[PDB]
Amino acid sequence: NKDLKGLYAALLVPFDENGQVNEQGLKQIAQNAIETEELDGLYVNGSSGENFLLNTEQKKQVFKVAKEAVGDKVKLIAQVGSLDLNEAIELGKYATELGYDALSAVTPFYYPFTFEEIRDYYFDIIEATQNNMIIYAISIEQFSELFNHEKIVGVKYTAPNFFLLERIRKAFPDKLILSGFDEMLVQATISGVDGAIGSTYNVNGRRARKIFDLARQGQIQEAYQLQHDSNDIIETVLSMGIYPTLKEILRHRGIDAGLPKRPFKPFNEAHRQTLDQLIAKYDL
Amino acid sequence: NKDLKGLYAALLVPFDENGQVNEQGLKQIAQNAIETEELDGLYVNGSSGENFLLNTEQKKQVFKVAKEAVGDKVKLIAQVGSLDLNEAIELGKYATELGYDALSAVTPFYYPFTFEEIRDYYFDIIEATQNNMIIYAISIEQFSELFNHEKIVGVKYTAPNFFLLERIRKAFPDKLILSGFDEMLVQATISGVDGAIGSTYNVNGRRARKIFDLARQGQIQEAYQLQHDSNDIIETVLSMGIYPTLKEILRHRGIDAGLPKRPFKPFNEAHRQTLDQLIAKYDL
Amino acid sequence: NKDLKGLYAALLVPFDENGQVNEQGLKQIAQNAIETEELDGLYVNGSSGENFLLNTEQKKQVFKVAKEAVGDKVKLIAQVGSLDLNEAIELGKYATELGYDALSAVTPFYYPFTFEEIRDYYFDIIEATQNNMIIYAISIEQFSELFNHEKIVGVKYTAPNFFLLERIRKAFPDKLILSGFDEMLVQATISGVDGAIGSTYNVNGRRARKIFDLARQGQIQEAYQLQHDSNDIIETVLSMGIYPTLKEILRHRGIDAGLPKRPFKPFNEAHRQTLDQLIAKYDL
Amino acid sequence: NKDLKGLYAALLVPFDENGQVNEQGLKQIAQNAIETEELDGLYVNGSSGENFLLNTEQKKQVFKVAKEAVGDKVKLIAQVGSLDLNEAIELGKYATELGYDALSAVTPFYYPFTFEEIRDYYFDIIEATQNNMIIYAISIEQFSELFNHEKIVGVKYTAPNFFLLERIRKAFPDKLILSGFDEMLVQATISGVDGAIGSTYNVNGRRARKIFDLARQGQIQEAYQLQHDSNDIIETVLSMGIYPTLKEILRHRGIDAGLPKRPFKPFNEAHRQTLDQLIAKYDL
Ligand SMILES: CC(=O)N[C@@H]([C@@H](O)[C@H](O)[C@H](O)CO)[C@@H](O)C[C@H](O)C(=O)O
Ligand SMILES: CC(=O)N[C@@H]([C@@H](O)[C@H](O)[C@H](O)CO)[C@@H](O)C[C@H](O)C(=O)O
Ligand SMILES: CC(=O)N[C@@H]([C@@H](O)[C@H](O)[C@H](O)CO)[C@@H](O)C[C@H](O)C(=O)O
Ligand SMILES: CC(=O)N[C@@H]([C@@H](O)[C@H](O)[C@H](O)CO)[C@@H](O)C[C@H](O)C(=O)O
């Protein structure tokens, strides 16, 4: 199997009027991420896929359509984290046996779980699935204990703290760190991350690779300049409602983008003009 | 079609090792709330019931068992809110048909939902269930808009703010306000709440009701004294892990309180004896 | 000597064009708080007095005028807190010998001071003045170590937390607790405070005594109603800029109440009509 | 005059045990930064020099000694921000007459000042001194309004947010941006800052230069390794109390670094060995 370096699209998901998965749309979006946007993998059933709004079978369904839509070279990570540990294990099992290269799982939220409970949450999932696990982000000393598990191969780092990122990069040199913040990709890149996961790479993945490459290939100034342009895109998208707007941009490419699953509201058409100017300026 | 003032137990729920509901153990906890603690009703599948760790079928299960557990004298509120809007509607109808007096739904969390998305999450559930709804706590202007809908009969108020609570109370003298903070019951009472929902009422319902009545009768210094050592209990139980420690205190009464659902951990025995020291001091 | 319980006006201060103190205005305001509003005492050079915008000379200046405006029976608390400990001790001495019945000092802010540095800040001021001290903002055990000192007679309690207030009151029955949140007086009173310090008592002093008295006598419903009324007032002045607005209300009584000290801005005349209506509705 | 690109020490200040400035030790700390760490300039009476613990005459004192101690080619920025706008104007005038190249002012704190009050605080100081101003503490238009002023030549940027920093660098390509976070120099550098202001540069100024230089020449990976080194130094120093520990390191170079001003506590000797190890490991 792989090491999981590279740039991943946080897979977006198209729905009908009743919060049901549009599979033909979903296949188009996965294929847009690899063939058109030229990314290395898909990060399936994360935040960006409106995962936590779904029921278990929808999650399995998305896991299914995504894996079928792409070649064997395409790296795949499966987010299975859920407040329902039994569900996590079940999705973990289902995903592992579909051939997903690694699992990852959101930290137990809502309740104020203790570190110990958070820790044995990950360990229980690994134990029942025997797949590689990527965690979320916790102190250095607590990472230290998590990464002591041979099956916890790394972290999806989403906290915009570049002091903590550097301490983590220095202390765990042989561990996978993927950054989760699109608008600070070039800062993550020189801070030594091994790749990135991103909702906006569904639309802007070709610029993201240049940032990631130029910044490691010395050409930091040009990389920055491309981060300037991407942050124009990101700030605009964030301002209209990020997921529906991204899917609105993909619809413009002849993709069946469907709707957001409620309680997410659809793209508000009062934003239509501004979005078309954005689509025109950066050619999306 | 009944009155909703009063003190509620937020139903605690017993599980086995595989995180399955201990059916018979639940029945007891239900009855312990009504008969021994003498509470006006049951708040079912709220956060205290570990509800967000469950799948839909367990949630229906807890709904039926809690209902068949109690008399009709007993007010029943069904917490039905979930990130899955479809699931909330399904639970909503199901709880309504079972005869729960009002529905109730947590604020859609995890994502940064706009206020209009939050508003139409409630309106969608009300529409599909045609049952009275109790919301969580969002500004006063926004409350005004939400309370404008007729089938929104009030709010379960958990925010530490007594300025805002006073403003709501004044601005909506005809809507129901149940407070959610056990350790400040005496302050919510004289702020004119219509009742309270609590986890610690499973154990301490009789000091709770006396806090509630004595305060309304202006016997306030007495009511306070009771808060002053209901807070002993609460401070203690929080420092040990509130839901497993609470269900520990019920085991000490012959109730089959089972285990927490993982990733919640079982009560840690290193506390066991500060615990029953307290069960002793306050006769729990 | 003096019993420090009671209601205190946090003393507003009038300035001229250049930021220099209006002593005649100040004396009127001082007298208004005792003679007109019938308060047991003054709290001089607190936040409400724009104290932290002042130089040392001016702070003394205020301390002197406030002493010379009232009678011997009038309780007088001096806030001398400052990031400059040399300054605090200089004012601490000056105010103690003017005859102020106690000193108060804000917790050292801006820098992330440790508890030890904070503790010994308070102890250093007492040792140099031998006067009584009221602490002004930490852990209940920290309170213990602070209140373990005989010359720390109490705390000006400002944080809107009624669990923590309940704990401090149970744990230190012999210590003085004055609350600083006017809009939650009634809740503070039934929580056993010995009195209160408020900016708005300069203007709504008489309703505050009634709130404080009625609450204690079990006339809780009438107390809460006067809280409704007073919160209309409080909410309104907060929305117009509280210190400039409070002072505007005072000018209506013919008190030469002057200007805020820059960079505070003068009362915006666009709020004039709404303020005049507030004044008329509540007879201010 | 000079245009203020480059690296500045946030000038540390030595005190006797009564909190009076050790002027000869200060003169030594000043030359240390320029002659030994080879920095481009001094940032004087910022928070690293314990400015907000001082009185006005001490502040002028530190402005005076620091200017005397250095050659005319040294860039000098005077922090004259105070809550007392009269004090700030006075200090700004003084530092300007002494010859300081620019003033700088902390945003008004402690009170909830509006944006307008903040804007006109800066505008008042500028008009009274006719010196260039460097702002620091939030919107982009709020930034754009301040930056509209030709005397506000830039900003000491201390918020560790690299989305906003990028947004400002793009929107104002011609303004001066100096970063204030030493532990993220390399991330600041590639984000296009014109330089940096730092307390630890008093001790690590040469490594900081190399980070700033190497990154801009696109040798990002060796710049980053030097950031790894500097963060060891910064993390250790924060864990021991940063200002006292920085001055202890200076003392080891024969500088009379004296004592922190109370309520700051002096360096704790239980940290001596760990500090000696750091000094040895990094040749400090
Ligand atoms: C919370 C979130 O959606 N963040 C996403 C980022 O791609 C974007 O920067 C974010 O959507 C907007 O900045 C990304 O990390 C998604 C996340 O990896 C996931 O699990 O889908
Ligand atoms: C966080 C929490 O569970 N709060 C509970 C309160 O009764 C208590 O004050 C809490 O358990 C202890 O602070 C209660 O509001 C739970 C809530 O009502 C529910 O839906 O179960
Ligand atoms: C921060 C502040 O000025 N709070 C005041 C309260 O009286 C009022 O509740 C506040 O002004 C309006 O909520 C009062 O505590 C003043 C303060 O104690 C002081 O030292 O002057
Ligand atoms: C609050 C503080 O001391 N920050 C300093 C930074 O150099 C360091 O990164 C800070 O010490 C944390 O490491 C520095 O920015 C101080 C500031 O520039 C000043 O005005 O002295």
At B153, list the tokens.
């009969």
First to last CA, chain B: 34
Q: In a 3-state reduction of DSSP, which class is residue C253?
A: coil
Contacts of A186 in chain D (CB under 8 A): 190-191
In chain B, which residue's Cα lies nearest the Cα of A109?
B110
Judge contact between D208 and D223, C-beta under 8 A: no
CA distances from C247 to B196, C199, D108, D258 (A): 41, 10, 22, 47
Q: How big is chain A by its Cα radius of gyration, in Å?
A: 18
Torsional sign, CA B199, B200, B206, B209? negative
Report the CATH number that the domain containing residue A187 is assigned in CATH. 3.20.20.70
B119: its two tokens = 């508003």
CB contact under 8 A, A167 and D235: yes
Non-local (6+) Cβ contacts of A220 within 8 A are: A186, A190, A214, D190, D215, D216, D218, D220
How many domains does one find in chain D? 1
Say which residues have a Cβ less than 8 Å from residue A78's Cβ, sequence separation at least 6.
Answer: A44, A45, A63, A91, A92, A95, A96, A98, A100, A102, A103, A104
Classify the C-alpha dihedral A269-A272-A274-A279 as positive or negative: positive
Method: X-ray
Residues 6+ apart with CB under 8 A from B238: none
- In chain B, residues with a C-beta closer than 8 Å to the C-beta of C226 are none
How far, rounded to the nearest angstrom, does the alpha carbon of residue A220 sit from its chain's CA centroid?
Answer: 25
Contact C45, C9 (CB under 8 A): no
Task: Look at residue A206 and give its three-state secondary structure.
Answer: helix
A241 contact residues in B (CB cutoff 8 A): 114
- Min Cα separation D112/chain A (Å): 26
Nearest to D84 among C53, C110, C111 (CB): C53
Q: Which run of H or of E encompasses C123?
A: helix C115-129
Let me know: does B33 contact B201? Beta carbons within 8 Å: yes
Q: Separation of B159 CA from ligand 2 center, angstroms?
A: 11
Element (H, E) at C252: helix C242-252
Spatial separation of the C-alpha atoms in residues B253 and B241, rounded to whole Å: 19
Q: Is C72 annotated as a binding residue?
A: no
Please check if D192 is assigned to a binding site: no
- Looking from the CA of residue C156, the nearest atom of ligand 3 is 18
Q: Give yes or no for a cis peptide into C244 (omega within 30° of 0).
A: no
Q: Indicate the helix (H) or strand (E) that contains C251.
A: helix C242-252
D50 is in an annotated binding site: no
Please tell me which residue in C43, C94, C100, C136 is annotated as part of the active site: C136
Q: Would you say A145 is a known binding-site residue? A: no
Pairing of strands B195-198, A102-104: unpaired
How far apart are the CA of D199 and the centre of ligand 4, in A? 5
What distance in angstroms lies between residue C162's CA and the mean position of ligand 3's atoms?
17
Here the tokens at position B89 are: 């509607």
C-alpha A138/C-alpha A94 separation (Å) is: 29
Question: For residue C151, with 0-12 CB atoms within 10 Å meaning exposed, 13-18 middle and 19 or more buried, which class applies?
Answer: middle
In the three-class reduction of DSSP (H, G, I as helix; E, B as strand; rest coil), residue A209 is classed as helix
Is C281 an annotated catalytic residue? no
Instruction: Measure the CA angle with vertex B175, ends B174 and B178; round to 5°.
Output: 130
Q: Which residues of A touch D192 (CB under 8 A)?
A: 224
SS3 for C249?
helix
Find tokens 């709010």 and name the residue: B155
Burial bucket for residue B112 (CB in 10 Å: 0-12, 13-18, 19+): exposed
Chain centroid to CA C185: how far?
13
Are D114 and D139 within 8 A, CB to CB? no
Query: Taking Cα atoms as reference points, which of C151, C120, C149, C154 lies closest to residue C136?
Result: C154
User: How many angstroms separate the CA atoms of C92 and C81, rounded?
Assistant: 8
Compute CA A107 distance to the chain's CA centroid, rounded to the nearest angstrom. Answer: 15
The three-state secondary structure class of A134 is strand
Of the candidates A160, A191, A220, the beta carbon closest to that of D161 is on A160
Nearest-angstrom CA–CA distance, A167 and A163: 6
In a 13 Å sphere around the CA of D39, the CA atoms on its Cβ side amount to 32
Q: Please tell me the distance from the alpha carbon of residue B165 to that of residue B92, in angstroms, as a whole number.
A: 28
Instruction: Please give the resolution of this entry in Å, rounded to 1 decimal.
Output: 2.3
Helix or strand (DSSP H, E) at C117: helix C115-129
Residue D178 in contact with ligand 4 by CB distance below 6 A: no
Ligand 3 geometric centre to CA of B177 (Å): 28
For residue C132 the two structure tokens come to 């009584």
- Asked if B54 and A84 come within 8 Å (Cβ–Cβ), the reply is yes
Cβ–Cβ < 8 Å for C187, B162: yes
Distance CA D233, CA D212 (A): 17
For testing contact with chain A, the best of D157, D169, D170, D200 (most A CBs within 10 A) = D170
The neighbour count for residue A194, using CB atoms within 10 Å, is: 17
Question: Relative to the CA of C163, which ligand 2 atom is closest?
Answer: 13
- Residue ranges in chain A assigned as alpha helix (H): 23-31, 56-68, 85-96, 115-129, 140-146, 162-171, 185-190, 201-216, 220-240, 242-251, 272-281
CB C236 within 8 A of CB C203: no
Distance CA C155, CA A158 (A): 41
Dist CA C83 CA C108 (whole Å): 6
For C263, the token pair is 């960079």
Q: How far is CA B124 from the centre of its chain?
A: 23
3-class SS at A6?
A: strand
Q: Residue with structure tokens 């009560």?
A: B267
The answer, for D111 touching chain C at a CB cutoff of 8 Å, is yes
Q: CB contact, 8 Å: C217 with chain B?
A: yes
Which position among B94, B100, B122, B136 bears the catalytic label?
B136
Q: Which residues of A touch B264 (CB under 8 A)?
A: 111, 113, 117
Burial class from Cβ neighbours inside 10 Å (0-12, 13-18, 19+) for residue A64 reads middle
Q: What's C266's DSSP letter?
A: P
A190 touching chain D per CB within 8 A: yes
Could you give the CA distance from residue D279 to residue D284 in angstroms, rounded to a whole number? 5
Q: Cα–Cα distance between D241 and D281 in angstroms, integer?
A: 19
Q: Counting ligands in written order, which one lies closest to the CA of residue A52?
A: 1
What would the DSSP string read from start to end of chain B?
A: -----EEEEE----B-TTS-B-HHHHHHHHHIIIIIS--SEEEESSGGGTGGGS-HHHHHHHHHHHHHTS-SSSEEEEE---S-HHHHHHHHHHHHHTT-SEEEE----SS---HHHHHHHHHHHHHHH---EEEE---HHHHHHHHHSTTEEEEEE--S-HHHHHHHHHH-TTSEEEE--GGGHHHHHTTT-SEEEESTHHHHHHHHHHHHHHHHTT-HHHHHHHHHHHHHHHHHHHHT-HHHHHHHHHHTTT----BPPTTSPPPPTTSHHHHHHHHHHTT-
Q: Does A140 touch chain D (CB under 8 A)?
A: no
The DSSP H or E segment spanning C171 is helix C162-171
Are the C-beta atoms of D237 and D257 separated by less than 8 Å? no
Backbone angles phi, psi at A172, to 5 degrees: -125, 70
Asked whether the beta carbons of residue D190 and residue A215 sit closer than 8 angstroms, the reply is: yes
Cα separations in angstroms, D192 against A124, A159, A208, C70, C208: 45, 22, 19, 60, 56
String of DSSP letters for C190-244? TTT-SEEEESTHHHHHHHHHHHHHHHHTT-HHHHHHHHHHHHHHHHHHHHH-HHH
D141/A contact by beta carbon, under 8 A: no
The answer to whether A127 is annotated as binding is: no
Whether the CB of D204 sits within 6 Å of ligand 4:
no
Residue B237's nearest CA partner among B206, B185, B208, B202 is B202
**How much is the CA Rg of chain C, to the nearest whole Å?**
18
Nearest CA to B178 out of B75, B100, B81 is that of B75
Tell me the sheet residues that pair with D9. D42, D198
How many CB atoms neighbour CB B121 within 10 A? 23
* CB atoms inside a 10 Å sphere around CB C57: 9
Q: What is the DSSP string of chain D?
A: -----EEEEE----B-TTS-B-HHHHHHHHHIIIIIS--SEEEESSGGGTGGGS-HHHHHHHHHHHHHTS-TTSEEEEE---SSHHHHHHHHHHHHHHT-SEEEEEPP-SS---HHHHHHHHHHHHHHH---EEEE---HHHHHHHHTSTTEEEEEE-S--HHHHHHHHHH-TTSEEEE--GGGHHHHHHTT-SEEEESTHHHHHHHHHHHHHHHHTT-HHHHHHHHHHHHHHHHHHHHT-HHHHHHHHHHTTT----BPPTTSPPPPGGGHHHHHHHHHHHT-
Give me the amino acid identity at B32. Answer: N
Query: Do the Cβ atoms of A55 and A282 come closer than 8 Å?
Result: no
Three-state DSSP class for residue A196: strand
Pick from A121, A263, A264: which is nearest to B263 by CB?
A: A121
CB A19 within 8 A of CB B86: yes
For residue A104, give the 3-state DSSP assignment: strand
CB C253 within 8 A of CB C226: no
The number of C-alpha atoms within 13 Å of B30 and in the hemisphere containing its C-beta is 23
Question: How far apart, in whole angstroms, are the C-alpha atoms of residue D42 and residue D79?
Answer: 10
Contacts of C269 (CB under 8 A, 6+ apart): none
How far apart are alpha carbons D164 and A179 in whole angstroms? 18
Task: Give residue C123's Cα distance to chain centre.
Answer: 22
Yes or no: say if D164 and D128 are a contact pair by the CB < 8 Å rule.
Answer: no
What is the domain extent for residue C124? 1-284
Q: Chain C contact for B235, CB < 8 A?
A: yes
- Which residue in the set B55, B124, B265 is minimally distant from A84, CB to CB? B55
Q: How far apart are CA B222 and CA B190, in angstroms?
A: 13
Query: Mapping DSSP to helix (H, G, I), strand (E, B) and coil, where does residue C85 land?
Result: helix
Q: What is the SS3 string spanning D157-215?
A: ECCCCHHHHHHHHHHCCCCEEEECCHHHHHHHHHCCCCEEEECCHHHHHHHHHHHHHHH
What single letter denotes the amino acid at residue B195?
A: G
Asked if residues B133 and B147 have their Cβ atoms less than 8 Å apart, the reply is no
The angle at the Cα of D49, spanning D66 to D253, to the nearest 5 degrees, equals 75
After which residue numbers is chain C interrupted with C–N beyond 2.5 angstroms?
137
CA A79/CA A91 separation, integer angstroms: 9
Task: Return d(Cα C26, Cα C255) in angstroms, integer.
Answer: 9
Chains A and D share 3 or more Cβ pairs within 8 Å: yes
A279: which residues sit within 8 A by CB, 6+ positions away? A249, A252
